[PDB]
């Protein structure tokens, strides 16, 4: 229920209200005058478990609609010349637990002529290791064509170990990268780094660091143009945590037709009115019922290869 709402007086605001609604569960009539709760704030909701319980619900509200569309045909997905030949990781894909430090100073009150003591907080966050993509594929077209490199990382077995079906698992897939590259007319091997991913953002510069820099520029003459929008998730979060034993995920490389995608136009963080560049709906082409896998499987420009992730303890 943003203001783009057609009939806000009727459809109200499920999601928002659901936030506040779940928050006072500690004090509804407010006899205690407890403050708002973890869920009644963005920098703190991911905290509380019902957070994900509440969005699974919202999630399948959308899924009901997302799923009403007729599955996709063959003539539908195909990029006529362009066929991926192979998908390989010149990698590892290994995840561990790094250590980070942010500063607790704005937290403690320091009046005056009492001086600053540098206090710090050290946290334990997840991390992985750089690994590159190696997409091998031919342009059996006459010239050069623009292409969208779409890469999802879907699950394989059930945690019962049932091994679901790219119907059961299509919706479960997390986007790992999306980029537009020009393909040359024949055999080519394109590469792509953990680090070039479009759904990722690096940890940010420290406050002090940004001070030192704002200052160091004003005492004798600032380019952090890297960080002026940043919509993404932490690079450390790219891949999932996994098992120490390791597990096999299913890597989906689907290469659609750049010219019809970007058939019109940062553009990742459209923070200022900037028209989202891709035109395909979102989660393409795994956003639709996939009744017989028989199909995904016979379009040249879609290819799936199993990867394996290991967790260093």
């Amino acid at each position: 229920s943003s203001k783009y709402s057609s009939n806000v007086q009727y459809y109200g605001s499920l999601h928002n209200t659901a936030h506040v609604m779940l928050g006072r569960q500690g004090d509804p009539h407010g006899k205690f005058n407890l403050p708002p709760g973890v869920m009644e704030h963005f920098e703190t909701a991911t905290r509380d478990p019902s957070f994900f319980r509440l969005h699974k619900y919202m999630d399948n509200i959308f899924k009901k609609h997302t799923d009403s569309f007729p599955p996709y045909t063959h003539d539908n997905l195909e990029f006529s010349g362009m066929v991926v030949n192979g998908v390989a990781i010149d990698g590892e894909l290994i995840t561990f637990f790094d250590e980070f430090q942010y500063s607790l100073i704005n937290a403690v009150d320091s009046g005056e002529n009492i001086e600053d003591v540098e206090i710090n907080a050290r946290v334990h966050r997840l991390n992985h290791n750089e690994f590159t993509y190696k997409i091998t594929m031919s342009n059996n077209n006459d010239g050069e064509r623009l292409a969208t490199f779409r890469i999802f990382l879907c699950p394989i077995e059930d945690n019962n170990g049932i091994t679901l079906t790219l119907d059961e698992a299509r919706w479960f897939c997390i986007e790992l990268d999306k980029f537009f590259q020009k393909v040359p007319s024949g055999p080519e091997t394109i590469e792509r780094s953990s680090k070039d991913s479009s759904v990722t953002v690096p940890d940010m510069p420290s406050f002090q660091s940004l001070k030192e820099q704002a200052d160091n520029a004003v005492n004798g003459g600032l380019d952090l143009s890297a960080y002026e929008r940043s919509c993404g998730i932490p690079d450390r979060m790219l891949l999932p945590k996994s098992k120490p034993e390791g597990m096999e995920f299913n890597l989906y490389v689907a290469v659609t037709d750049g010219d019809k995608d970007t058939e019109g136009h940062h553009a990742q963080c459209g923070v200022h009115g900037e028209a989202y560049p891709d035109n395909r709906p979102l989660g393409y082409p795994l956003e639709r019922r996939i009744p017989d896998e028989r199909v995904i499987d016979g379009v040249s420009n879609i290819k799936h290869v199993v990867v394996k992730i290991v967790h260093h303890l």
């Binding site: 059930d158 019962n160 170990g161 049932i162």
Partner: protein, 321 residues
């Protein structure tokens, strides 16, 4: 005697149990014998025999080709009378005879049960090794599928072995409970030391009490272990005031009887007519839990028998089971 004799006889007795015997000797015996005409073979001057007969006569004994549970207070009594004959035989001539004579007009369950317990406890059954229940009466140890696959084999007279079956449950720790070896032991353990033993039968099973305490503590432990190995959590303790969380479908069938009733999950314990009230347990449990807590068990006279000693846990197992 011998054994390769006693033994032979046994094997014959328990052969194709669900149908009148095909071993000619067993049948002229089955016909011509009279358990009441030489009250001398019997160490009771055949009071046992004369009591079965009386029932067999008023024909008030459970029918053949019918089910049987050892939990049925009558079915048990009947089963247990056969035990009592077979039991006071001075020699093989009297056992064979009876477990032939009866074999042919007593129900199979009572019969199978009777013969085993009898062989196990009676003075006269030393040499013998009993065939594995699982092959004697396979409906109690085999799946319902394999069972039907076997009935088909037979209909068509075409032989062969079928593979039995067992991601959605905790029928992941199934390999443990459904094993034909454990199932054997579990029954044998309680054949060895039956809940119904009266020391009149001849001797005294020593510490059946602690034995009882312990045997289950180990199934219970052994079981807890397997669930460990399966990312499963130690087992919930059952309460009479709560729901039966984890129900199952056995997909098992009786030979004569039908298919084992299934239980849905999240059910409420119902007062079952004929056995006892739900509450009837609750109180029992209390009476039990008060002996433990007092230090003493109180008998029928209001005599407090102390259990804060070594004999303790068995006296407790005597009242608990």
């Amino acid at each position: 005697t011998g054994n390769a004799q006693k033994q032979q006889d046994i094997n014959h007795l328990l052969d194709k149990i669900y149908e009148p015997t095909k071993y000619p000797d067993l049948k002229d015996i089955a016909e011509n014998f009279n358990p009441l005409g030489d009250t001398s073979i019997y160490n009771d001057h055949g009071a046992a025999v004369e009591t079965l007969m009386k029932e067999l006569n008023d024909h008030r004994l459970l029918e053949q080709r019918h089910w049987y549970s050892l939990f049925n207070t009558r079915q048990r009594k009947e089963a247990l009378m056969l035990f009592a004959v077979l039991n006071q035989c001075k020699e093989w001539y009297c056992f064979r005879s009876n477990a032939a004579y009866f074999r042919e007009r007593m129900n199979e369950g009572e019969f199978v049960y009777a013969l085993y317990v009898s062989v196990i406890h009676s003075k006269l059954g030393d040499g013998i090794v009993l065939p594995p229940l699982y092959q004697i009466t396979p409906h109690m140890f085999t799946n319902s599928e394999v069972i039907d696959k076997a009935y088909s084999a037979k209909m068509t007279q075409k032989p062969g072995t079928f593979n039995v079956s067992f991601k959605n449950r905790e029928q992941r720790v199934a390999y443990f409970g459904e094993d034909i070896g454990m199932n054997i032991h579990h029954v044998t353990w309680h054949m060895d030391f039956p809940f119904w033993w009266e020391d009149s039968y001849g001797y005294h099973l020593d510490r059946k009490g602690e034995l009882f305490f312990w045997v289950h503590h180990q199934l219970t432990a052994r079981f807890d272990f397997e669930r460990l190995s399966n990312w499963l959590d130690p087992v919930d303790e059952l309460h009479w005031d709560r729901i039966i969380r984890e129900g199952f479908a056995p997909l098992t069938s009786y030979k004569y009887g039908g298919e084992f009733p299934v239980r849905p999950d999240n059910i409420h314990f119902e007062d079952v007519d004929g056995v006892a009230h739900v509450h009837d347990l609750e109180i029992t449990e209390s009476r039990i839990h008060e002996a433990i807590d007092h230090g003493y068990i109180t008998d029928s006279d209001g005599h407090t028998i102390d259990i804060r000693q070594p004999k303790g846990i068995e006296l407790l197992g005597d009242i608990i089971e």
